[PDB]
Amino acid sequence: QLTPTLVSLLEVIEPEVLYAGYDSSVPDSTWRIMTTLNMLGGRQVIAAVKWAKAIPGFRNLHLDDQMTLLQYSWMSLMAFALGWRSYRQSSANLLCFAPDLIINEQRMTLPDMYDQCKHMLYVSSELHRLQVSYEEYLCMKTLLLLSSVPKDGLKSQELFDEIRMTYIKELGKAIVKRSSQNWQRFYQLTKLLDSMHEVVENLLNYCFQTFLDKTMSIEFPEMLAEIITNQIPKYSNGNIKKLLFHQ
Amino acid sequence: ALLRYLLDK
């Protein structure tokens, strides 16, 4: 394949699912779960960073750049992967957060549960609608890391773009495998990385209240603290840029 | 913060 593929790469650099560490037995509790996802979130995040530095060209960007990129698209990446996991078999749409923390028919019936899962289901249901191959998923996964930037680019913009494209190219080769009007297939996928922007949005709107109100009783690991705290009134000043494909 | 130590460690 003209030696190691940048694709067959991310595939091995792709992280390994974590366990919620949920108790189950004690009847389910809405926040008992949410608060259980969050703890888990921070780990995936952390695991994501390691996954990022592990990408070609990433370590190369100016650190402050690398530092904000993740800062933005952590949500976006957290949700895209999960969609995959649910899509992986959960025909009942079941939200699969961990190999031990899945959200079934009736777990979904819980208080203000479906009220937010509906968004996450969007993905998997969408991914399932486009039968995305693990290859394409990997490549898009990476491209979501670049879904949004400042408003004034980065100390390594030139680089950043340089890289980005190469993946937009790696994704092409990805779609290729399996021809004809491949160009439409490309379109559909491409319009879904843009969809994520709204997705990643509603999630923040729900995540910030819950992160704020202690009349909720939900807890976040420190990881997401620095990360949330920061990004909050921050991006809420239109100081960021949600990168698109189609306007 | 730690995000940076993790990033640059």
Ligand SMILES: C[C@@H]1C[C@H]2[C@@H]3CCC4=CC(=O)C=C[C@]4(C)[C@@]3(F)[C@@H](O)C[C@]2(C)[C@@]1(O)C(=O)CO
């Ligand atoms: C819907 C929002 C957004 C949610 C996150 C969406 C992305 C994600 C994917 C996973 O594979 C594991 C955990 C996380 C990282 C998450 F699921 C939890 O942290 C809980 C969360 C903040 C949320 O439920 C809350 O508002 C909790 O209060």
